[PDB]
């Protein structure tokens, strides 16, 4: 072990830095965030 452990620190450190380096893995997240809701409904619960 060694290298893929600070590997995956650096994977956990840089979360949020991948979300704003990365174009992709952003948007898409909000197609599963609101699409589902976009396609359910926008209206809430009511």
Not at 9 to 38: C, K, M, N, Q, W
């Amino acid at each position: 072990f060694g290298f893929k452990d600070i590997i995956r620190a650096i994977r956990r450190i840089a979360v949020p830095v991948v979300s704003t380096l990365f174009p992709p893995a952003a948007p898409l997240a909000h197609a599963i965030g609101e699409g589902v809701d976009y396609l359910l409904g926008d209206e809430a619960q009511a």
